[PDB]
């Protein structure tokens, strides 16, 4: 029900910030001026023609229109009921971990964005760190409030089957797949057995803001014996 | 292996430290006040202190509940313990307790607890340890979460505490570790030693069991009168042995929805066979399932019948226990006892004195109560009174202290808490004005126990005592010769003489001699029974004296059938014929297995029916003869123990001058005599009260209240009342008819 | 602090009274017949009469339902008395009768009630008070809507009084009177008083006794003949100490169509 809106007030002002504009990209999008065509994601056009209008924005690419918006609605509701177990599930303590882990992933999926020449790229992270996040979260049912005939094994396919409907080009979230395939590894199998080189470089810009980062033990009293 | 050992419940009561064996201690090397690193499940590992203390087996390592929570384990588990001496003295400990103690109070825990508990302890102290401490009523948790050096440090001068910060919760497992175990019970040996030795091999290792191919018991019942802890004893049990104790309440099945109950009672029976080996409970089955014929109803019929189904159904299939609670075992309906249902059953009874204490003392835990405390006269008077009464006397008695304290003109908002609790004492005045206050639910009710008149409290005919004793505990305790010689031993004897001969007071005397358990039953509740409620009660006092075998049954007014046989009534005749006639059934139906005696008594044994005088039936008789002289001085001197003994004079001519008479008669002499001793007290002390009041400070000198002293004058007008209590002729009536007998 | 008093229950039933001990009376030099000024909850304001009472404990004041709902505060409570000297003799009061309280009387209230019962008082009122008066067979309420001066005021033989008009509407925190009480009850004080004992104090101290962690009654058994006083007894308790009383019937429940019920 309507109860995003304390999640979203509870919030402090950065991290509020951030997912605001994750989750408001699309709507800012639909200023009206700058028509969604714009940016289809041509890796190709870029790299060989000019394409000025595609820099890095092709990389956050969302269409949305009249017979849409109202699906738009749910799209962000079930961001919500993500983002509220996602930031709890998996990594809920690591503030800058965050940020870094989220800038690795984004570089990866980027990569092999460029390798391809597909369109959309949010909703393939969104569920690629949806599954690398369930995959720990594996065999429990959760029903909602109007919700009581909640059976098990059919939730990834209809959601498929939901987003197949409405559009095409579905392979797509497969690449997706790809780079959560890696997040997982990089939770279970890269740091210990491969030993090589790491493309991944974490720069100071995070540690310079530090958000809560808090191990102080208030203050202390003198014992004796 | 000088690895594993397995544990056992620790005898001592400090956290830190455990008893170890002499052999044990050699062959791993470590000593008094050595630290040793204990690893346990889950990667749990914990710092203890090594304690000499032989009374431990070398296989058993003594440990008690906070380790066992500590270590994240339960009752014989398997843990390594190894040398470990190496840990360093701490600098800092940020530490927070558990969140369920703000509850009203607000408090700095640093000096009402910490302090307290660590003043020179010395206690090893490791990252995500858990411990407790008792204060003024509540026993408070407390987490360490950082220490200084990481893990290891103790309790030491250079230690700075962080104990800032809101409480965090109870960690996870922990939350049902808050209170319910095995010490939280007394006066139940027996019962939770039969319940632990028939219950712990299934659940400890179900895989084990049904491996082997025997059958697990699956009906336990049992009945007592409510409030006795059997909720709590399940639940406790439940929570030490390890399952997924599911309760399920009585009176709310029923009315539920109509007929939607056994959905839900389906619905529960598949979740626990869901959920691994479970214990699941159900109280006041007669609430559930009464007696067919109580029925009204058709629905009812039909959960009782689906019950049934469910529970016969469960045969194997999992590791699953039946627990059940009820009152009265009648009650339920019988086809509720066949072989695969309902089979084993137990009676909860009432605790005695040292059970009394014993819950008291449990109960009288948190509290520090004034140093006046004499519970043990407390719990001879509360004879009839169980644990919920007593945890009610506990609780009133605090609550009467705190008033005593009186509101200090305050609003006790967060403000005073911490200077009371810490402050508090519990008067003797407070325990008088709680017995004043006392409404016993017992009350009229049978209670089976060991009597504890002995020998020496009897003082005459030791021939009788030599033969009772012969007769009884030889065949118990030499079956060898019996089975060797081949034959069966008596099991009831009379006894007729003149009344107010204590055969009752013999009765007890050798009942506590055998040290077994005694039952009193008197003529009038007898022939109360007589008219409809007879079989029944038969049946289940033969019964309860079976099951708590050895025992001496006992029988009183064993004449008042044949009183009222013969007389101007004639009403209760047949009625006592049945009676009679039920009694000699059943004690011809008891078996030669069950080691329980039985003893009549009267004092006009003419009138009883010949049939009672039968082989297998009453056969061996005792007559009791009169007191006399070094009867009577045995008797005067056994029971003249009192306080106010005076200096006395010769109990030889004492006897003289009552010769022909019973010890009632002695005993009304003597109690007369105190009396006459207390009126001359009451009235010396209101003549002292009179010339105090009438001439102001008239004994300024301190003297002490007149002595206690019985004088000779007093025993005069004792026996100027030389009572005949027994006839005369009779005597040689009861001698003939013995001699008549004696042919 | 010998200034601030704990109100309890009293025992004058006279409007105008606060029974202070003789040591009361000389630590604070107070005269008898004084007014005196009475601080309490609800940022409410006072005047009374000091009168005389060796029963109560130096700490203890004794005080009637009248001013204790004055002062909008129940029994327990803690209240600040001071002398106030300072009070000077009444010249008009404007008093407006409750609108329940003067049905069916078609009478002068001049000359029946307001005479006998102002008749040498000398009363102390403030503005916002409300006293009750007793009549023929009827006891009325009049509020003090207007006085001079305002707002605490002397009741004097030189004052002119006026009740005509519409009757003022109900207020809400009022506590109004005519309510059963402690008073209400004969010939049962032994009973009232064992029962007042063990349920006081969970009541008033929701958390001490909480933070003592001792468990509390929850059920207790009246018995004995119809129309005793069983429902007036439970009304007056909730009524005096201040609770949230709820009243259900038997016969009601078995009105109804089962499950509903
Ligand atoms: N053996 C006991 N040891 C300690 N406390 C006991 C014992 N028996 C009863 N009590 C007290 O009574 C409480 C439980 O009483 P309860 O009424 O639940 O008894 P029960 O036999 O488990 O079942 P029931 O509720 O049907 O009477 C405990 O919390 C404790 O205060
Ligand atoms: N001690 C008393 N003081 C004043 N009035 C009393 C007293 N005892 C009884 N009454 C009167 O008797 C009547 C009893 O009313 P009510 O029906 O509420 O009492 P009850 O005893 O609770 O009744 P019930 O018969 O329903 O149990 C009322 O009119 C009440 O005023
Ligand atoms: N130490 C004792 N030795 C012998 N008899 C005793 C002793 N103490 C009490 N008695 C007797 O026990 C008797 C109990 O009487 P009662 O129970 O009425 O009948 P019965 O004597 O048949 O049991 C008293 O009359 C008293 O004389």
């Not at chain 2, 001496?85 to 607890?113: A, C, Q, S």
């Not at chain 2, 007071?505 to 009942?511: P, V």
């Not at chain 2, 509740?525 to 019964?543: C, P």
């Amino acid at each position: 029900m309507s109860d995003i809106g304390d999640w979203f007030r509870s919030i402090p002002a950065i991290t509020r910030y951030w997912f605001a504009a994750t989750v408001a990209v699309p709507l800012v999008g639909k200023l009206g001026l700058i028509s969604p065509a714009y940016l289809f994601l041509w890796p190709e056009a870029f790299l060989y023609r000019f394409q000025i209008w595609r820099p890095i924005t092709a990389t956050f690419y969302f269409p949305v229109g009249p017979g849409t918006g109202f699906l738009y609605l749910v799209n962000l509701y079930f961001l919500y009921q993500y983002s509220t177990r996602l930031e709890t599930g998996a990594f809920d303590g690591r503030p800058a971990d965050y940020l870094f882990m989220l800038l690795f992933n984004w570089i990866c999926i980027v990569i092999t964005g460029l390798a391809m020449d597909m369109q959309l790229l949010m909703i393939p992270l969104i569920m690629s760190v949806l599954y690398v996040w369930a995959q720990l979260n594996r065999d429990m049912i959760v029903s909602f409030w109007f919700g009581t005939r909640f059976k098990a094994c059919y939730l990834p396919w209809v959601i498929l089957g939901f987003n197949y409907i409405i559009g095409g080009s579905v392979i797509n979230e497969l690449i997706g797949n790809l780079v959560g395939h890696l997040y997982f590894f990089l939770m279970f199998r890269y740091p210990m057995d491969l030993g090589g080189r790491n493309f991944l470089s974490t720069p100071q810009f995070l540690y310079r803001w530090l958000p809560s980062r808090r191990h102080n033990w208030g203050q202390g009293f003198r014992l004796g014996d | 292996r000088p690895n594993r050992l397995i544990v056992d419940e620790a005898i001592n009561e400090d956290n830190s430290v455990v008893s170890l064996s002499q052999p044990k201690m050699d062959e791993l090397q470590l000593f008094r006040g050595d630290t040793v690193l204990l690893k346990g499940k889950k990667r749990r590992e914990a710092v203890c202190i090594v304690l000499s203390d032989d009374t431990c087996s070398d296989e058993k390592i003594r440990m008690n509940r906070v380790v066992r929570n500590n270590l994240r384990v339960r009752l014989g588990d398997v843990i390594s313990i190894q040398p470990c001496p190496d840990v360093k003295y701490g600098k800092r400990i940020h530490v927070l307790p558990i969140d369920d103690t703000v509850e009203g109070i607000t408090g700095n825990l640093f000096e009402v607890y910490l302090k307290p508990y660590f003043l020179e302890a010395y206690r090893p102290i490791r990252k995500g340890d858990i411990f407790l401490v008792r204060g003024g009523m509540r026993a408070v948790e407390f987490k360490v979460v950082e220490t200084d050096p990481s893990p290891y440090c103790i309790v030491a001068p250079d230690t700075v505490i962080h104990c800032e910060g809101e409480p965090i919760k109870r960690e996870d497992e922990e939350e049902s570790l808050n209170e319910v175990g095995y010490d939280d019970i007394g006066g139940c040996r027996k019962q939770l030693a039969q319940i632990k030795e028939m219950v712990e091999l299934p659940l400890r290792h179900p895989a084990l069991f049904k491996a082997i191919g025997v059958k697990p018991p699956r009906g336990i019942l049992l009945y007592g009168p409510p409030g006795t802890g059997k909720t709590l004893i399940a639940r406790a049990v439940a929570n030490e042995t390890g399952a997924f104790f599911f309760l399920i309440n009585g009176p709310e099945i029923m009315s539920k929805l109509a007929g939607e109950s056994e959905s839900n009672l389906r619905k529960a029976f598949e979740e626990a066979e869901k959920n691994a080996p479970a214990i699941i409970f159900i109280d006041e089955l007669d609430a559930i399932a009464p007696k067919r014929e109580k029925t009204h109803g058709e629905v009812e019929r039909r959960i009782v019948s689906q019950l049934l189904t469910l529970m016969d159904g469960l045969k194997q299939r999992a590791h699953v226990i039946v627990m059940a609670a009820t009152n009265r075992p009648n009650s339920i309906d019988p086809a509720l006892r066949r072989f695969g249902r309902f089979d084993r059953e137990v009676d909860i009874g009432i605790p005695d004195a040292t059970g009394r204490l014993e819950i008291l003392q449990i109960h009288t835990k948190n509290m520090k109560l004034a140093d006046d405390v004499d519970l043990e006269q407390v719990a001879n008077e509360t004879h009839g009174h169980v644990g919920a009464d007593l945890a009610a006397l506990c609780s009133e008695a605090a609550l009467q202290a705190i008033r005593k304290k009186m509101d200090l003109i305050d609003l006790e908002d967060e403000t005073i808490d911490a200077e009371v609790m810490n402050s508090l004492a519990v008067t003797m005045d407070d325990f008088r004005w709680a017995l004043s206050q006392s409404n016993p639910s017992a009350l009229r009710e049978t209670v089976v126990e060991v009597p504890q008149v002995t020998w020496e409290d009897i003082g005459g005919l030791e021939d009788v005592k030599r033969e009772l004793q012969e007769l009884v505990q030889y065949p118990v305790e030499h079956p060898d010769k019996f089975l060797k010689f081949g034959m069966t031993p008596s099991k009831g004897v009379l006894f007729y003489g003149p009344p107010g001969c204590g055969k009752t007071l013999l009765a007890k005397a050798i009942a506590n001699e055998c040290q077994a358990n005694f039952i009193s039953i008197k003529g009038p509740e007898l022939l109360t029974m007589w008219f409809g409620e007879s079989e029944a009660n038969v049946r289940e006092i033969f019964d309860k004296a079976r099951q708590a075998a050895p025992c001496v049954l006992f029988f009183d007014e064993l004449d008042s059938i044949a009183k009222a046989r013969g007389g101007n009534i004639g009403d209760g005749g047949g009625a006592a014929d049945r009676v009679i006639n039920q009694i000699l059934t059943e004690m011809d139906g008891m078996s030669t297995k069950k080691n329980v005696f039985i003893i009549g008594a009267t004092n006009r044994p003419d009138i009883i029916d010949p049939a009672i005088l039968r082989p297998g039936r009453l056969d061996q008789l005792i007559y009791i003869p009169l007191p006399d002289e070094k009867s009577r001085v045995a008797i005067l001197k056994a029971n003249l123990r009192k306080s106010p003994v005076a200096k006395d004079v010769d109990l030889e001519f004492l006897a003289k001058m009552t010769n022909g008479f019973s010890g009632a008669d002695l005993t009304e002499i003597c109690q007369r005599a105190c009396k006459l001793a207390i009126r001359e007290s009451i009235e010396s002390e209101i003549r002292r009260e009179r010339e105090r009041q009438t001439n102001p400070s008239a004994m300024e000198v301190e003297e002490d209240d007149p002595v206690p002293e019985i004088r000779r004058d007093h025993f005069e007008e004792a026996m100027r009342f030389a009572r005949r209590s027994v006839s005369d002729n009779d005597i040689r009536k009861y001698e003939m008819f013995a001699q008549t007998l004696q042919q």
